[PDB]
Amino acid sequence: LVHVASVEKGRSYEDFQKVYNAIALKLREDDEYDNYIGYGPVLVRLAWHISGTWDKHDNTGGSYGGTYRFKKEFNDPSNAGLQNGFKFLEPIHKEFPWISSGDLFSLGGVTAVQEMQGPKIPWRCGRVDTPEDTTPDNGRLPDADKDAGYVRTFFQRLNMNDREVVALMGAHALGKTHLKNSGYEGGGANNVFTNEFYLNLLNEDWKLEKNDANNEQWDSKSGYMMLPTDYSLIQDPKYLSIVKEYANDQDKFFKDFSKAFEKLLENGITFPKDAPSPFIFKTLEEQGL
Ligand code: HEM
Ligand SMILES: Nc1ccnc(N)n1
């Protein structure tokens, strides 16, 4: 099963920069969302969830087909809360109706990372909407209650190694958990992309507590929170070494995150040899906008 990237007809970098800018300007405007976190974190999560259905064994799922637009996927319990991100992107899609759904959802993630002062994430266009029957069944996204071995095995299906997994999980500095979405609560209100996930894991005093949904999570008195799967990164000796590395090297974390996140967003896609090079979008700030 082969998904060949096909550039939206006649479109070029400048077209996609316009879409980036519209997302970025709406991120700035709609600042009240989720007690003033804004939509950055939820858009990052959306990009990851639409990508994280991929299965390397058969090339099912993945970002290419834009299948999150179909009810089976939209309604996955694992996706509860992402409807907020989809509704954010609706007016962007109306303005730019030519962009494919997978391109839009993945570009939303890139835009959010960059506008939150994260690394540049190169991004390629050409995902093509596929029909409803290509939607992957629910259950491909990861559970949060499990341990390091679960996380390691889980990510092999997405062709991610230990460094890639630990880098990707640094996104858990962003936003928060919401009890009514996932059965986990808390984390604060951060909307700046930094390496603080790693620092927090290493330097906070963590307690294993039960939340109001009767699930265990790790809490600190400063207000940070780690899921069991987050905390597993300091329980496993191989993950812990990498956590330490990123805690101690912001640039290294940014570079490794960028490469893993692009990879995630591109898994499953065949780029023809004469496809455009990846685009690196300017932030609003770099444009003086
Ligand atoms: C073992 C892997 C992972 C597990 C089990 C997991 C689980 C979760 C859970 C349960 C939440 C809370 C959702 C809610 O209640 O609203 C969450 C939030 C989030 N996740 Fe993950 N996650 C994983 C990996 C990732 C990865 C790889 C990324 C992206 C690179 C990511 C990005 C985020 C973001 C940005 C949020 C905050 C959402 C918001 O503030 O609305 N997660 N995750
Ligand atoms: N453990 C997590 C996951 C996502 N966001 C925050 N603030 N904490």
Q: DSSP letter for 209, please.
A: E
Does residue 168's CB lie within 6 angstroms of at least one atom of ligand 1? yes
Instruction: Give yes or no on whether 1-141+261-289 and 142-260 have one common fold.
Output: no
CB 271 within 8 A of CB 185: no
**Nearest atom in ligand 2 to 190's CA:** 7
Cα 283 from Cα 95, distance rounded (Å): 20
Note the ligand closest to the C-alpha atom of 220.
2
Q: In terms of CATH architecture, what is 142-260?
A: Orthogonal Bundle (1.10)
The owner of tokens 């499990």 is 146
Provide long-range contacts, Cβ within 8 A and 24+ apart, for 144-149.
Answer: 144/182, 144/184, 144/227, 144/228, 144/229, 145/215, 145/216, 145/227, 145/228, 145/229, 146/228, 146/229, 146/232, 147/228, 147/229, 147/232, 147/235, 148/232, 148/233, 148/235, 148/236, 148/239, 149/236
∠ Cα 180 197 221 (to 5°): 65
Pocket test for ligand 1, best of 63, 87, 177, 216 (most atoms within 8 A of CB): 177
Ligand 2 pocket residues where CB is under 6 Å: 172, 174-177, 187-188, 225-227, 230
Pocket test for ligand 1, best of 79, 115, 172, 217 (most atoms within 8 A of CB): 172
Q: In terms of CATH architecture, what is 1-141+261-289?
A: Orthogonal Bundle (1.10)
CB 185 within 8 A of CB 179: yes
Residue type present at position 108 = G
Does residue 42's CB lie within 6 angstroms of at least one atom of ligand 1? yes
Residue ranges of domains in the chain: 1-141+261-289, 142-260
Q: Which residue in 23, 38, 47 sits closest to 96, CA to CA?
A: 23
Cα 7 from Cα 4, distance rounded (Å): 10
Return binding residues for heme b: 45, 48, 172, 176, 178, 181-182
Q: DSSP letter for 172, please.
A: G
Residue type present at position 258 = S
228: number of Cβ within 10 Å: 21
Pairing of strands 175-177, 207-210: unpaired
Residue type present at position 210 = K
177 alpha carbon – ligand 1 mean position (Å): 8
| Helix ranges (DSSP H) in 139-281 | 148-156, 162-169, 179-182, 196-203, 228-235, 237-247, 250-266
Q: How far apart are the first and last CA of the chain?
A: 42
The number of C-alpha atoms within 13 Å of 104 and in the hemisphere containing its C-beta is 24
Cα 39 from Cα 45, distance rounded (Å): 10
Cα 204 from Cα 219, distance rounded (Å): 9
Rg of the chain, C-alpha, whole Å: 18
**Nearest atom in ligand 2 to 226's CA:** 1
Note the ligand closest to the C-alpha atom of 109.
1
Cα 37 from Cα 39, distance rounded (Å): 7
